PDB file of C-alpha atoms and ligand atoms in Angstrom:
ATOM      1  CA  UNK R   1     140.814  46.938 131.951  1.00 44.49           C
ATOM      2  CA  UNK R   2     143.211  48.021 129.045  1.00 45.32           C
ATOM      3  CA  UNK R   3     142.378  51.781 130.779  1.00 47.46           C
ATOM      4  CA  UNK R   4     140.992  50.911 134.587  1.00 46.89           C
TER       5      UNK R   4
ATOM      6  CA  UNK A   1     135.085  69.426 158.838  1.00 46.16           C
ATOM      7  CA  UNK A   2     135.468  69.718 155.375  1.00 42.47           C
ATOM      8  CA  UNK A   3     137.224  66.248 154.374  1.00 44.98           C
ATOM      9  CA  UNK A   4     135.409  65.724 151.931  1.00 46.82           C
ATOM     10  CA  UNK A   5     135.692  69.421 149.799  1.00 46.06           C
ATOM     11  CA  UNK A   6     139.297  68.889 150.677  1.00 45.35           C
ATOM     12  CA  UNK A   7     139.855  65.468 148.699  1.00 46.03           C
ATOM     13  CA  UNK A   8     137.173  66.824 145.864  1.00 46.58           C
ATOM     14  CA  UNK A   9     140.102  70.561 145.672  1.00 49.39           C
ATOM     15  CA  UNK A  10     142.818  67.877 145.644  1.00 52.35           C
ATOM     16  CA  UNK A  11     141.671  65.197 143.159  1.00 49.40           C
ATOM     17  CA  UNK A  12     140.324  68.162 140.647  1.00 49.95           C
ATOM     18  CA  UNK A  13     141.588  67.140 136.785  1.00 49.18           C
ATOM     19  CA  UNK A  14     144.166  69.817 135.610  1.00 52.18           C
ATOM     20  CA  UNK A  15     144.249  71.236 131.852  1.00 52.02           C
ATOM     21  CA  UNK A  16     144.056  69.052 129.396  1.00 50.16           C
ATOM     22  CA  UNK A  17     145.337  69.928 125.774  1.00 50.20           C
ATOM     23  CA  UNK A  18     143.762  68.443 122.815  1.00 52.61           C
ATOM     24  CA  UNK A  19     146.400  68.836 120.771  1.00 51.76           C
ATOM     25  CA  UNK A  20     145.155  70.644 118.154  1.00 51.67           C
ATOM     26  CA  UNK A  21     146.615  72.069 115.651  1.00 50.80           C
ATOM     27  CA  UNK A  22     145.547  75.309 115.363  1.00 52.40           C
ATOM     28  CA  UNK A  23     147.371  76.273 112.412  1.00 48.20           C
ATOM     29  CA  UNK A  24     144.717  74.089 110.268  1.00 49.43           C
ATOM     30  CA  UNK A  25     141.625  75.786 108.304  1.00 50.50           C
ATOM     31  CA  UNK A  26     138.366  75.017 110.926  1.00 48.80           C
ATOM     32  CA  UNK A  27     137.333  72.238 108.750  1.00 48.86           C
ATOM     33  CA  UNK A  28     134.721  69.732 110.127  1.00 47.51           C
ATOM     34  CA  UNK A  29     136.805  66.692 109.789  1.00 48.94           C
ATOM     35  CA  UNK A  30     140.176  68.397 111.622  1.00 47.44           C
ATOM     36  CA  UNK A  31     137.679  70.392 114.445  1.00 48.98           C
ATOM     37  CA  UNK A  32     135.409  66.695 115.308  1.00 43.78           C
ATOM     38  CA  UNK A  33     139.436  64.685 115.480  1.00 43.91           C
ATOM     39  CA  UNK A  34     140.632  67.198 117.680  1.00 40.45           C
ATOM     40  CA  UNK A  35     137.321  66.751 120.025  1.00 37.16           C
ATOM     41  CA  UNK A  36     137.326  62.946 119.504  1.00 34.30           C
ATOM     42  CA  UNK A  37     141.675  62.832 121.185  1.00 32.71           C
ATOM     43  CA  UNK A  38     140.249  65.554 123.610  1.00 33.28           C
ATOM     44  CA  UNK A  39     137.696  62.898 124.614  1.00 32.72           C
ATOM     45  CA  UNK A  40     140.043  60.134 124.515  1.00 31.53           C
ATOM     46  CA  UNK A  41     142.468  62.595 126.404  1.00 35.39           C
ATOM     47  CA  UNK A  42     140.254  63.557 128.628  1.00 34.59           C
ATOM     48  CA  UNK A  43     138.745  60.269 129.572  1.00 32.97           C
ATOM     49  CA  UNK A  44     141.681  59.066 130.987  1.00 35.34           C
ATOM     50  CA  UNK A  45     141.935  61.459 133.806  1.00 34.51           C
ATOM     51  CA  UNK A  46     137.938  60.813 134.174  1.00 36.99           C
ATOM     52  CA  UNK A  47     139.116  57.478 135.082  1.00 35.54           C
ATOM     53  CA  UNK A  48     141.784  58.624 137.580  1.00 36.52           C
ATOM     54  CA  UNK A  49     139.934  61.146 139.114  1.00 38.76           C
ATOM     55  CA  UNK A  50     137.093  58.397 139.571  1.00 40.66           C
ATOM     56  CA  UNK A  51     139.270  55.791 141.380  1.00 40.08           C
ATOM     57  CA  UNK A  52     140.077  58.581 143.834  1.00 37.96           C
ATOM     58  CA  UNK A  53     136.803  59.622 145.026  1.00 39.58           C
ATOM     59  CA  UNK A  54     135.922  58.555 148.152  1.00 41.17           C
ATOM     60  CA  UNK A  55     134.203  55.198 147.965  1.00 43.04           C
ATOM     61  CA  UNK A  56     134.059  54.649 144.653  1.00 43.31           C
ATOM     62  CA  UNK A  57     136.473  51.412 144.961  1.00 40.01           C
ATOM     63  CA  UNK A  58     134.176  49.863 147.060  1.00 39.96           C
ATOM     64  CA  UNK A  59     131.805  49.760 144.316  1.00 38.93           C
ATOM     65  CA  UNK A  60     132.230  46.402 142.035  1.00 40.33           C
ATOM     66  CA  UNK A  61     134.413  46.668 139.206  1.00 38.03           C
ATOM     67  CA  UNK A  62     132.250  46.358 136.534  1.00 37.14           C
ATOM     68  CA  UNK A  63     129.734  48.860 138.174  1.00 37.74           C
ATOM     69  CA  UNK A  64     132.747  50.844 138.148  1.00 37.93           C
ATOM     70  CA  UNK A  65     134.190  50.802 134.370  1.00 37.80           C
ATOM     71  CA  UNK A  66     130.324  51.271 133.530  1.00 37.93           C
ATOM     72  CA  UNK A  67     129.328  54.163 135.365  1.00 37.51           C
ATOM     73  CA  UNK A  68     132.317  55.967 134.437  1.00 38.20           C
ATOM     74  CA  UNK A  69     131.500  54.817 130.543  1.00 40.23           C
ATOM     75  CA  UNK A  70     127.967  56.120 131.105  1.00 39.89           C
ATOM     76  CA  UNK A  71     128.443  58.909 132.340  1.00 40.54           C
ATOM     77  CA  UNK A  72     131.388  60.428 130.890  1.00 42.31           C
ATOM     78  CA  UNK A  73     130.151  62.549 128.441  1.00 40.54           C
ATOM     79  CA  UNK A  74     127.645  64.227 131.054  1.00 39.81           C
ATOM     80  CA  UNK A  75     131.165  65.057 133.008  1.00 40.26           C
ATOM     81  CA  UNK A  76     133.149  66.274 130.428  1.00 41.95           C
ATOM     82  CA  UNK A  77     130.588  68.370 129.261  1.00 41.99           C
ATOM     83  CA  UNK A  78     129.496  69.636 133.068  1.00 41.65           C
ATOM     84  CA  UNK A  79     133.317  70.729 133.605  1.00 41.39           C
ATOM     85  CA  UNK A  80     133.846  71.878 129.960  1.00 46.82           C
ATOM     86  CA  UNK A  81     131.138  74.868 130.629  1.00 46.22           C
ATOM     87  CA  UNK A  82     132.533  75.758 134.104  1.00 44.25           C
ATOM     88  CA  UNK A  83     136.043  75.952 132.271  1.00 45.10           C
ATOM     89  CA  UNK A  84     134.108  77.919 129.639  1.00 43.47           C
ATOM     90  CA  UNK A  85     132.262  80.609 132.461  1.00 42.57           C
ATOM     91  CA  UNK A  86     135.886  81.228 135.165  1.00 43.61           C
ATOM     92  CA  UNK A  87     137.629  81.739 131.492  1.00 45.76           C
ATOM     93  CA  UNK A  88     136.070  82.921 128.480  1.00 44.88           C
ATOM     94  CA  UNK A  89     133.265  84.482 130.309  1.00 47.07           C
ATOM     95  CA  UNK A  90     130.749  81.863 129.195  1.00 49.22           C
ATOM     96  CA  UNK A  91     130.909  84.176 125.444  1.00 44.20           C
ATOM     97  CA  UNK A  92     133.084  80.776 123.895  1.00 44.31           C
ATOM     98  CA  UNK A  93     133.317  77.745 124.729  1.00 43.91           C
ATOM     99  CA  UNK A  94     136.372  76.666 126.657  1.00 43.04           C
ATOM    100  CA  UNK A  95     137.330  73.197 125.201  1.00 44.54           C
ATOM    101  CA  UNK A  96     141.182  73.337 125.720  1.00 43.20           C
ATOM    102  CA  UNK A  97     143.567  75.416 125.486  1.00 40.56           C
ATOM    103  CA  UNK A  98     144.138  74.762 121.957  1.00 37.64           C
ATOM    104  CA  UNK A  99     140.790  74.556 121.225  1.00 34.95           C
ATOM    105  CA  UNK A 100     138.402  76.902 121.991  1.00 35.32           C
ATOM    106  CA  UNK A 101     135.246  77.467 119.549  1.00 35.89           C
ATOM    107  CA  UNK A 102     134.059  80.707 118.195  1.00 38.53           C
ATOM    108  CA  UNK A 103     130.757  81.232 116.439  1.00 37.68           C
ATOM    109  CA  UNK A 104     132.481  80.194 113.239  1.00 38.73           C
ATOM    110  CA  UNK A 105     133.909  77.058 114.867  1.00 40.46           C
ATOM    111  CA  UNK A 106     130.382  76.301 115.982  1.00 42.82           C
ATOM    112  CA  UNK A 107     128.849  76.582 112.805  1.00 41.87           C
ATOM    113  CA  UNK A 108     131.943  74.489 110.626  1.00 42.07           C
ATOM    114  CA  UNK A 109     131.672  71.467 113.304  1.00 45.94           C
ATOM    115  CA  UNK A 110     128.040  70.795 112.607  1.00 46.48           C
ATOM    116  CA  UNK A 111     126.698  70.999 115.583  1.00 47.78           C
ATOM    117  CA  UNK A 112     125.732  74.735 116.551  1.00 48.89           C
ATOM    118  CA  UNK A 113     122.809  73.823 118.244  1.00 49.07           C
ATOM    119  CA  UNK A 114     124.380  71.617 120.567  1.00 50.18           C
ATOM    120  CA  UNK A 115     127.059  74.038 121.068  1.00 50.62           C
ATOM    121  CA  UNK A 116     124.483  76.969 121.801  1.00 50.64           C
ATOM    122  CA  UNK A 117     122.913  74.806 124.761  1.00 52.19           C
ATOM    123  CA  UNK A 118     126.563  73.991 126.203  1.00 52.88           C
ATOM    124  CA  UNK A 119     127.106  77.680 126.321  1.00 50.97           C
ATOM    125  CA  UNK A 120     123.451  78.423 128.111  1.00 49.93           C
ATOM    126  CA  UNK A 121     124.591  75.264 130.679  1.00 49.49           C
ATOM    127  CA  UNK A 122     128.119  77.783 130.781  1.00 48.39           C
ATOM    128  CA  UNK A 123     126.072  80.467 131.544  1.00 46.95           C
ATOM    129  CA  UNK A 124     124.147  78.899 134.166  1.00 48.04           C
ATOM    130  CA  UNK A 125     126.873  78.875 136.580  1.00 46.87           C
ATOM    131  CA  UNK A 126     127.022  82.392 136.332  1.00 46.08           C
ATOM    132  CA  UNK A 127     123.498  83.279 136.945  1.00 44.07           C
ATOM    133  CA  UNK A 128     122.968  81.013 140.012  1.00 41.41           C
ATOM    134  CA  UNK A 129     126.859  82.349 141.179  1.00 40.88           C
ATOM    135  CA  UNK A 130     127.522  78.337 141.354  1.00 42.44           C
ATOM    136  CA  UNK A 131     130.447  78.236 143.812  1.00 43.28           C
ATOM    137  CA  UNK A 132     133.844  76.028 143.028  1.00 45.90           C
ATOM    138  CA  UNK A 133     132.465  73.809 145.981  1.00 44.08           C
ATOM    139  CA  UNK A 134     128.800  73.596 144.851  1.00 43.47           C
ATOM    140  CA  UNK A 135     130.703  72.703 141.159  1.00 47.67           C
ATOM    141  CA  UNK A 136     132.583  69.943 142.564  1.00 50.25           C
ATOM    142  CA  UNK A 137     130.054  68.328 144.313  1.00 50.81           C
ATOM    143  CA  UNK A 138     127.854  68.818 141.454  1.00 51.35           C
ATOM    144  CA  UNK A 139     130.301  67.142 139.353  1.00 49.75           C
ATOM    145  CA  UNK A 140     130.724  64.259 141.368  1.00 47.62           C
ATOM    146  CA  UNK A 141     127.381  63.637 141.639  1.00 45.41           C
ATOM    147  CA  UNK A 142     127.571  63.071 137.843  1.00 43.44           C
ATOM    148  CA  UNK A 143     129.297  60.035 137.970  1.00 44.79           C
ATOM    149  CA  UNK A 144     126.354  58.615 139.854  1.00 44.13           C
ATOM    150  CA  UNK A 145     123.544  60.007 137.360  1.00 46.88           C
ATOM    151  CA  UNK A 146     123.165  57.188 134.749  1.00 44.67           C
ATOM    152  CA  UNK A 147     123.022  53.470 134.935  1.00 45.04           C
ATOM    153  CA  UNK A 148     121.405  50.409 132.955  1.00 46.64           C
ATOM    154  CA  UNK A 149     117.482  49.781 133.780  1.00 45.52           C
ATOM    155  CA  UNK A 150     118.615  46.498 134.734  1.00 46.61           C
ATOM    156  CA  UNK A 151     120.719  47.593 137.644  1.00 47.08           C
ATOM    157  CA  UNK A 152     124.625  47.221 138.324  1.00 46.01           C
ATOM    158  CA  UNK A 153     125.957  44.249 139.835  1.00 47.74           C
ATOM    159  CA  UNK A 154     125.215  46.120 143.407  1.00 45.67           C
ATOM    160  CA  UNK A 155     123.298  48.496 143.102  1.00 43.18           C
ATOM    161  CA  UNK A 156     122.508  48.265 146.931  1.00 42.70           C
ATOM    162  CA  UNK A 157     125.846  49.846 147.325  1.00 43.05           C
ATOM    163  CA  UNK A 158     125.833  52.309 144.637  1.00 42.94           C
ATOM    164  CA  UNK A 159     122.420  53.808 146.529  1.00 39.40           C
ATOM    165  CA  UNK A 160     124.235  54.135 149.425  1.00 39.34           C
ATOM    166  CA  UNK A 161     126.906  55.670 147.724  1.00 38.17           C
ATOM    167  CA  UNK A 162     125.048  58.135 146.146  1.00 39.06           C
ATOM    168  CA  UNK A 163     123.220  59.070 148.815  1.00 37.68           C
ATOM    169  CA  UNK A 164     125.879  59.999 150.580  1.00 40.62           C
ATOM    170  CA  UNK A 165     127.155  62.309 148.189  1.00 38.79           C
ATOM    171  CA  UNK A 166     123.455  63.825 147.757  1.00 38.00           C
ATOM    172  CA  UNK A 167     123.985  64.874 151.497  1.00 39.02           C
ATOM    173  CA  UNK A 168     127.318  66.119 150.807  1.00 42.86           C
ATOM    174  CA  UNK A 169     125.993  68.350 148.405  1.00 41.87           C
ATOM    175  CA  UNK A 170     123.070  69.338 151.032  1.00 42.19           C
ATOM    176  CA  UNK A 171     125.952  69.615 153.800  1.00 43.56           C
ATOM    177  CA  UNK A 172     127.961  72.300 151.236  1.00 39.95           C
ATOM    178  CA  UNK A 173     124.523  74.376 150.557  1.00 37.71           C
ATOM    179  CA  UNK A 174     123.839  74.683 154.342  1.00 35.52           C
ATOM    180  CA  UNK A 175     127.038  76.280 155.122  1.00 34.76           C
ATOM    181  CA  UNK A 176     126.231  80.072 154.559  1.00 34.71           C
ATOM    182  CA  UNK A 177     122.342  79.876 154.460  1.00 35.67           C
ATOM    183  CA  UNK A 178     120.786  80.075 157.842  1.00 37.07           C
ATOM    184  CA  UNK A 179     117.241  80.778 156.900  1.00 32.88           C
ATOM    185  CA  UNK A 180     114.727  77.429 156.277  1.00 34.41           C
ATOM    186  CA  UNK A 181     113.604  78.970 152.607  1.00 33.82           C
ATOM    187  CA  UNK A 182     117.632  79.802 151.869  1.00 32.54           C
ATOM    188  CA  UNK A 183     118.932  76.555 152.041  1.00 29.31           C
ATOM    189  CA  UNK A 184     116.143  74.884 150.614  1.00 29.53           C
ATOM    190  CA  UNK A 185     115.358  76.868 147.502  1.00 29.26           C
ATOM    191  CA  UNK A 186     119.453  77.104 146.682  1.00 29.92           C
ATOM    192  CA  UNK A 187     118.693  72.682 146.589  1.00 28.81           C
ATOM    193  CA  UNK A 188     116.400  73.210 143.824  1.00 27.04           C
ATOM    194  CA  UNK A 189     118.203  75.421 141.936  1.00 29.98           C
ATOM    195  CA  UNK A 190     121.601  72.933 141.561  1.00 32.06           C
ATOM    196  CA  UNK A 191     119.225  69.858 141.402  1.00 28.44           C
ATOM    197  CA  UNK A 192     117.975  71.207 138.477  1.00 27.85           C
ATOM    198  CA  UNK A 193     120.900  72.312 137.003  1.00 28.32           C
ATOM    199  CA  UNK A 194     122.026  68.813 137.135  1.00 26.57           C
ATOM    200  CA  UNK A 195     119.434  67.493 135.896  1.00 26.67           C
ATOM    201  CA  UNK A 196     119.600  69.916 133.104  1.00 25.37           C
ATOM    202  CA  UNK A 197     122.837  68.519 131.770  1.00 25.25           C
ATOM    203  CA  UNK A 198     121.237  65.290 130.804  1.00 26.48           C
ATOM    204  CA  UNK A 199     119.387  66.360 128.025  1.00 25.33           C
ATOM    205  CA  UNK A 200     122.479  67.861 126.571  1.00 30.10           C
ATOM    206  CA  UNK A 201     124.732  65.292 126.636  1.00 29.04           C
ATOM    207  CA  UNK A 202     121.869  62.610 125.462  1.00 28.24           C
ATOM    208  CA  UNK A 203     122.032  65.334 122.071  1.00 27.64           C
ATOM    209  CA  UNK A 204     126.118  64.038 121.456  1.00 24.67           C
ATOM    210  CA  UNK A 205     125.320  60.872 122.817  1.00 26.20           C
ATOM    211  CA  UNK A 206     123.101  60.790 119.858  1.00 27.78           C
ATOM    212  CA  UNK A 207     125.407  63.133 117.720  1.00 25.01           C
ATOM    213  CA  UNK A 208     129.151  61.197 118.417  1.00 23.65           C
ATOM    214  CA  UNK A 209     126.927  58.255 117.760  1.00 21.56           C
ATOM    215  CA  UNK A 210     125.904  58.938 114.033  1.00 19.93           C
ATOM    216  CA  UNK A 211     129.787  60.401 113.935  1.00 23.89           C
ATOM    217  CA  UNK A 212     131.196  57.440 114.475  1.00 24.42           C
ATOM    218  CA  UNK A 213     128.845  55.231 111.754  1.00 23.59           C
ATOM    219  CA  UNK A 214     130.059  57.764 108.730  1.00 24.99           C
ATOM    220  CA  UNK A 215     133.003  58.266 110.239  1.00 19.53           C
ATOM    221  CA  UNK A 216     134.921  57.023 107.384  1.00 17.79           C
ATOM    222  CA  UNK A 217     132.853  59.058 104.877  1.00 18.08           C
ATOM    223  CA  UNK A 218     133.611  62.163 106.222  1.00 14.66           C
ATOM    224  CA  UNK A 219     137.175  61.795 107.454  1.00 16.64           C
ATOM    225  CA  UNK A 220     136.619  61.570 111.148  1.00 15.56           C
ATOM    226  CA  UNK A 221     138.970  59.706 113.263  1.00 15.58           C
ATOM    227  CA  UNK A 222     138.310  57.832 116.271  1.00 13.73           C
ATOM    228  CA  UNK A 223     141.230  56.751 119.272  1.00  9.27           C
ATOM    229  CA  UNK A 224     140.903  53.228 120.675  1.00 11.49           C
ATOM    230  CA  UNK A 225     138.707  53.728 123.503  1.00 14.00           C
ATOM    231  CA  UNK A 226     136.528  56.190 122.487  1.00 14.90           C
ATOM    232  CA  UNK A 227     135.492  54.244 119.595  1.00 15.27           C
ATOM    233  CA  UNK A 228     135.233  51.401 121.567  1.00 13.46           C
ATOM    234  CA  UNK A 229     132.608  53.232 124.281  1.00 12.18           C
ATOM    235  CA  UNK A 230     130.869  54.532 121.385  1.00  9.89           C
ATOM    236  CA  UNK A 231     130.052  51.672 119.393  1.00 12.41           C
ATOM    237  CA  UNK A 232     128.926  49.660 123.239  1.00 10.83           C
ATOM    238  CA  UNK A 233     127.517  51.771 125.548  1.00  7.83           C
ATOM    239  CA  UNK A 234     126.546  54.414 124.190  1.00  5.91           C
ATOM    240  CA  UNK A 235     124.091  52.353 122.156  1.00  7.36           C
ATOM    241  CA  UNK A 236     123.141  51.637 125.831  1.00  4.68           C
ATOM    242  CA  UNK A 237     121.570  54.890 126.039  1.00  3.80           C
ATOM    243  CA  UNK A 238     119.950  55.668 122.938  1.00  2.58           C
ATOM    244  CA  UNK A 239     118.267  52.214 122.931  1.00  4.71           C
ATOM    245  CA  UNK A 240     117.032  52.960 126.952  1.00  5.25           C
ATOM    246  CA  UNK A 241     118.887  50.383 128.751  1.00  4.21           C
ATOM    247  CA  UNK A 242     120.865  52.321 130.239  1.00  2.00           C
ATOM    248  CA  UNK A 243     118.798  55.828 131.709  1.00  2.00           C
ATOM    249  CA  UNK A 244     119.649  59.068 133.623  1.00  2.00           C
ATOM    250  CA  UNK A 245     118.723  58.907 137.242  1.00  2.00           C
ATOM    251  CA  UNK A 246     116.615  62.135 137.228  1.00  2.00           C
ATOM    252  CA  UNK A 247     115.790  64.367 140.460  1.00  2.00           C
ATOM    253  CA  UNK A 248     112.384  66.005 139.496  1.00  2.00           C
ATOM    254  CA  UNK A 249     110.438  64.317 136.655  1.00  2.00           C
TER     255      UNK A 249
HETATM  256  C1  DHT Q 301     133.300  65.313 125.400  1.00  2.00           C
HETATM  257  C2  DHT Q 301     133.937  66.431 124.493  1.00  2.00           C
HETATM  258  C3  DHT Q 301     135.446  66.588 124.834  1.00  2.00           C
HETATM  259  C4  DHT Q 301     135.782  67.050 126.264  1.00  2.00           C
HETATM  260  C5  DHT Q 301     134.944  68.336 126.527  1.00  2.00           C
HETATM  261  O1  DHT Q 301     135.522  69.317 126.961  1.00  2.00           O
HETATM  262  C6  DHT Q 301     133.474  68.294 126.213  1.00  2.00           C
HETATM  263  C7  DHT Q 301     133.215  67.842 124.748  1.00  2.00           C
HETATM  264  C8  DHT Q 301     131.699  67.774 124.398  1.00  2.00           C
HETATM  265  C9  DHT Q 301     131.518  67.337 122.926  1.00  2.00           C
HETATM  266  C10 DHT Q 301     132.185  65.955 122.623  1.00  2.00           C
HETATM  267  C11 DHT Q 301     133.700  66.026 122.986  1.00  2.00           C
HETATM  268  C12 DHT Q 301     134.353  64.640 122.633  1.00  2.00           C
HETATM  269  C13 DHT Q 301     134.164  64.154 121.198  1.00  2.00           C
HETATM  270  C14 DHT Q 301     132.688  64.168 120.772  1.00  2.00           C
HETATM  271  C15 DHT Q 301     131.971  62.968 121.486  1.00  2.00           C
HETATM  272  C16 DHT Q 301     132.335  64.206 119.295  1.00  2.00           C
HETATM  273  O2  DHT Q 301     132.383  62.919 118.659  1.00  2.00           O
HETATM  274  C17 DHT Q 301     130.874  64.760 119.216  1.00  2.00           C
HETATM  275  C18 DHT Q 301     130.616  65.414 120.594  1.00  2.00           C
HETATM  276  C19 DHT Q 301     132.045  65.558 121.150  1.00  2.00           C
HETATM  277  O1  4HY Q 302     131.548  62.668 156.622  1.00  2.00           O
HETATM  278  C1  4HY Q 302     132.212  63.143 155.663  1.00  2.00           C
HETATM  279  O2  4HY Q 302     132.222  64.342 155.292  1.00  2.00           O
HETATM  280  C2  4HY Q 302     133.121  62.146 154.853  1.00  2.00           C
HETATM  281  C3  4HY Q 302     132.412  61.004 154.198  1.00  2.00           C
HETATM  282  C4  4HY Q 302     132.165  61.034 152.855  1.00  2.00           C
HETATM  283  C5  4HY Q 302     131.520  59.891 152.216  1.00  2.00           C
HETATM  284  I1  4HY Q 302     131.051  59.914 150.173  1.00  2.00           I
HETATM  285  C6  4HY Q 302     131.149  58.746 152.972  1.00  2.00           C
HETATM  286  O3  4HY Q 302     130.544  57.666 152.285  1.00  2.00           O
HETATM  287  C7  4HY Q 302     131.090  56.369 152.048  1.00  2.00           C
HETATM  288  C8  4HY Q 302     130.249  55.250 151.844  1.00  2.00           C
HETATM  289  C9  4HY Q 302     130.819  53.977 151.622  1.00  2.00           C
HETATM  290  C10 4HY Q 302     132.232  53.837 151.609  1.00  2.00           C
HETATM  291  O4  4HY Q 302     132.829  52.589 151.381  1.00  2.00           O
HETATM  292  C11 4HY Q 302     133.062  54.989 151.822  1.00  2.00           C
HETATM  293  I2  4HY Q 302     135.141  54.833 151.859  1.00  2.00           I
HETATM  294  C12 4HY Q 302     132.471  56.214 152.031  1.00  2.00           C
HETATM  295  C13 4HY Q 302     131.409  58.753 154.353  1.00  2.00           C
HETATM  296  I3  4HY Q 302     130.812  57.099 155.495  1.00  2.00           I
HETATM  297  C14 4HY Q 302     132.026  59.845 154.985  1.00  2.00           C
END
């Protein structure tokens, strides 16, 4: 996600 | 052959500033900020330094954001106090660079008790002469010390996984011990330390938690993502659904  | 140390030496985090500005009076609101980007900061190499250990893509990708949501905190802290005992000699702790607390710092961010177990975890390493390998392991083993009562979406292969790493940990130990007591009572000692770190991060689990609610009344600010984690799993934890995986009880 968004930070992954 | 040590594959394995050699991706954990390679894969290590490097310094991480919080960007604090150190020209500010130690007031709670500016000292809790800084810590909250640090986090934020800080996170984000969490998550690279996550993706690069060996295996952990196998695991799902939700078990993966979660674990690494979970068990943050227990990281940051673990690494914070061996930062704290190879630099300022365990006396301070060893935030970042540009933030490093004194007694006074302790005292003004409201949370000296916390602080004062952090520093006995700092001062751990020293007394059991924790090696940087033992320490990375350690750390590793972290990642895989906290998940929802429920279960992740495979947990068969996150048992495996952390298995393995248990015996990685074993496989570091046994490599200057030769007696059967050596090796073995050297287990116990780390096992415990680990399990040690638990407790302390469940107190700013608890602590970041309450933060965040009156954040706004005492002029604490929040980044994206760490607001984010706060607010959803961390509730996780206080509320027992999600629990630390424990090696004595
Ligand atoms: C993880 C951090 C930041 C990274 C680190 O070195 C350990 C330290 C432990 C205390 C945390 C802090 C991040 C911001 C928090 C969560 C504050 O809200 C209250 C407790 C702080
Ligand atoms: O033997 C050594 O030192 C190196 C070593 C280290 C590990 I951690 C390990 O575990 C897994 C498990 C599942 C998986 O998908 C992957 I990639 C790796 C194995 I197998 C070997």
């Amino acid at each position: 996600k968004l930070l992954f | 052959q040590p594959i394995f140390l050699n991706v954990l030496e390679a894969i290590e985090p490097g310094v991480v500033c919080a960007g604090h500005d150190n020209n500010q009076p130690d007031s709670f609101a500016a000292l809790l900020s800084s810590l909250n980007e640090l986090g934020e900061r800080q996170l984000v190499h969490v998550v690279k330094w996550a993706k690069a250990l060996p295996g952990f893509r196998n695991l799902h990708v939700d078990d993966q954001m979660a674990v690494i949501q979970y068990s943050w905190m227990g990281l940051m802290v673990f690494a914070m106090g061996w930062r704290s005992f190879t630099n300022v000699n365990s006396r301070m702790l060893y935030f970042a660079p540009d933030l490093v607390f004194n007694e006074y710092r302790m005292h003004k961010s409201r949370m000296y008790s916390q602080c004062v177990r952090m520093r006995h975890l700092s001062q751990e390493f020293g007394w059991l002469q924790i090696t940087p390998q033992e320490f990375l392991c350690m750390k590793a083993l972290l990642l895989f010390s906290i998940i929802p009562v429920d279960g992740l979406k495979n947990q068969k292969f996150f048992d495996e996984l952390r298995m393995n790493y248990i015996k990685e940990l074993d496989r570091i130990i046994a490599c200057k011990r030769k007696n059967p007591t050596s090796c073995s009572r050297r287990f116990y000692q780390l096992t415990k330390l680990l399990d040690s770190v638990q407790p302390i991060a469940r107190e700013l689990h608890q602590f970041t938690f309450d933060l965040l609610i009156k954040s706004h009344m005492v002029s604490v600010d929040f980044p994206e993502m760490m607001a984010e984690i706060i607010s959803v799993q961390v509730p996780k934890i206080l509320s027992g659904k999600v629990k630390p995986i424990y090696f004595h009880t």
